[model samples]
Target: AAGGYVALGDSYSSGVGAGSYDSGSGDCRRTPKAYPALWAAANSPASFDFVACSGAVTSDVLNKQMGPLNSSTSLVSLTIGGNDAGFADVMTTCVLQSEANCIARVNTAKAFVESTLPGRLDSVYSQVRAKAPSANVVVLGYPRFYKLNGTCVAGLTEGERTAINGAADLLNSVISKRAADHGYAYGDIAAAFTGHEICSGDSWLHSVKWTGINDSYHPTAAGQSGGYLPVLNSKA
Candidate 1:
């Protein structure tokens, strides 16, 4: 139904945890099993551009991924701001450091979400609108890595998991608000991920993979198909 669909954002959108990356991929680690690729395959859009990269911050999208968008672009979707909120750092700290240290890290990240990330999201949203004035921009948000008040993991205590989920909620709130400001659709995947969080018996998300840290804390292939795709399709 669309002329060109551009998928943009960071590790979440790039399929970092879903293994079997594109053989030609670089640090982006994009894969065919990711939601964007899956959507493209099912819909058969005129043009499908997968430019989202792992570790992409807000500035990276504004600078690197914006090139593919123009007046003719018809569909766009992205999941960002987690990196800008220092999510990776917070997760690492919570696992490796003491509880107090983890709290401090999360507090710092929370502050960024409340203070700095809003403006950053606005700038990127504005640029996307300017580049593809007619594109249906769908801003997707992060799912809670763990099931709150559910089963507990060995490394991450329930309290730590709660903090992390809180940070995700804060990030999603800002993202949802920004999407509304730009009149774009906001795809909230948290509901779809409800029972399949890391702590859930059937987790769609990946736990820490010490063997390959790159695969840690990201959604599994199941997460993309079962948890993310349906919600996005409905919203988009």
Candidate 2:
């Protein structure tokens, strides 16, 4: 970690679920335990800029977060595409609506991922490469929210979980392909989340909670420390 390291993207990268948020920006929520922060804690990059924000779409990254990337930047990691896939809507449909309704909503999200998300990702990837010409740009993908094969009380049905997980896979496929096309590394954390999905006995992901509303469906500190940081550091 000798050069400038700039972390960018949506909630997953911003550490929405992991608490101990940065005091300066309430919306950005860059926590001390997020993958970017955790990586920096161990590696201590020359300059670490955490500009990722919650609820950011592809356009938001392209328009707002690009300011940090310059010729000197050497590391960049981001997890996106979930917001673009209407993640909130899908979660709401799965948790609040019927199984059939959730399936329909997930199907709609998959369609968008296949047809529309690629172009958006390509634009962002190209811009990232242009902005940080010498940086190791690692495009991270979202994990499947649920453990489809596990059982959990008061959770979405297996059918609904399968459908939603399928949507996540589709989004990852698009993001991975885009990252590769731009000659950037793609850190697939799907395996890291294994046995620790939403329905598992000891899950790394956060479930829908009334008390910690922002933590819903986001990765816990363990998810970042144990799951995201290792995979991303491997790429680094």
**What lDDT, from 0 to 1, does candidate 2 have?**
0.87
**Native-structure RMSD, model 2:** 1.1
Cα displacement (angstroms), candidate 1, residue 86, comes to 1.0
Residues forming the 10-long window of minimal summed lDDT in candidate 2? 147-156
Off by over 4 Å in 2: none
- lDDT by residue (tens digit), candidate 1, 52-109: 9999999999989999898878999999999888888888899899888988899999
lDDT of 2 at 116: 93
Question: Residue 6 error for model 2, in Å?
Answer: 0.6
